[PDB]
Amino acid sequence: QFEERHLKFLQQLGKGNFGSVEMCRYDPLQDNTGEVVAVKKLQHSTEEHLRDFEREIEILKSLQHDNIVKYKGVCYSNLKLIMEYLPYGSLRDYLQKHKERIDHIKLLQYTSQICKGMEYLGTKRYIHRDLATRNILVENENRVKIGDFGLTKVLPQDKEYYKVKEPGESPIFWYAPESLTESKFSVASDVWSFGVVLYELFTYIEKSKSPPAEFMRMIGNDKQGQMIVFHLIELLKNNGRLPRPDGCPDEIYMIMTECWNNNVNQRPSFRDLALRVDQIRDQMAG
C-alpha cells in the first residue's frame, strides 16, 4: 500500500481535534514522479484516540461519493491515513482569499454539494458532528467535498441519536441546542450545523462576523469563559440567532433559520435542503 520511507513531507495542511494533515509526495520510485497526497496522523497518539482513528478510517474507506474526500489507503509504522490531495484547500480559506471570484450562485452550488454528501452520510447512519466550512474541501472552482470525519459516528441501531461527550474543546457555536444540553447528535443536529455552514458561506468568512464573534457579542464578552456554554444555551432557548449576513437574500436566510429550529423534528432534511437550494439556484440563473 503506502510505505513510510516513500513519503516526503511538503507542508502542514491543517489540524482538527486530535489530528493533523500534511501535504506529502508519495514517491516510491524516488525519482520525483510520485503523486501528491494528504496524510492525516494523530497529533499525539493515545490508545483511546487511535481506537477512534481506526474507526474514522473505516468510516472514510466506506464512503464513495463525488462530494466526499477520497481515501487512498493507510500507512503504518504509527498509523497514518492517506487521502487524495485537493489543491484549493478548505472552503473556509478558499472563500476568504477569493471572495472575489465567488458569487452567490457559486455559494449555492457548494451548498447543494454539501447537502448531497451529507445525505449520503445519512444513508449510512453516519453523524458527522463537525460540519463547518474549515472541514469542507475545494476540488476545483465548481466542486467541494466533505474533507474530514474526525468526530463522525454511527448511530446506534435502535436509536436515531448518538450521545457523546468528548474531552476538551467542542465547536459549540456550530452545535444544536440539544447537543449542547443533552450531548445528542443526530442527522437533525447535522442539519442545525449545516445552517451555520450556510451562514459562514454568506458572510464570506468575514472575521468580525464569525459565529463565535457574533454569539460572543450577543452573550457579552464580559460574561465569562465557562458559563459561556450556559449563556449560549439560554440565548438559543430565547430564540437568539446568528444575524442574516450582509447581502444574504431573505430566502437563503429562511433556509438557515429553519435549520436552527429548537424543535429537532421540525428541521428540514438534507434532501429537502438540496431541492430548495438547487431551485433558488435556477431562479437566479434565467
Ligand SMILES: C[C@@H]1CCN(C(=O)CC#N)C[C@@H]1N(C)c1ncnc2[nH]ccc12
Ligand atoms: C480541509 C481538510 C479537512 C480538515 N483539515 C485538517 O487538517 C483536519 C484535520 N485534522 C485540513 C484539510 N485540508 C486543508 C486539506 N487540503 C487539501 N487536501 C486535503 N485532503 C484532505 C484534507 C485536505
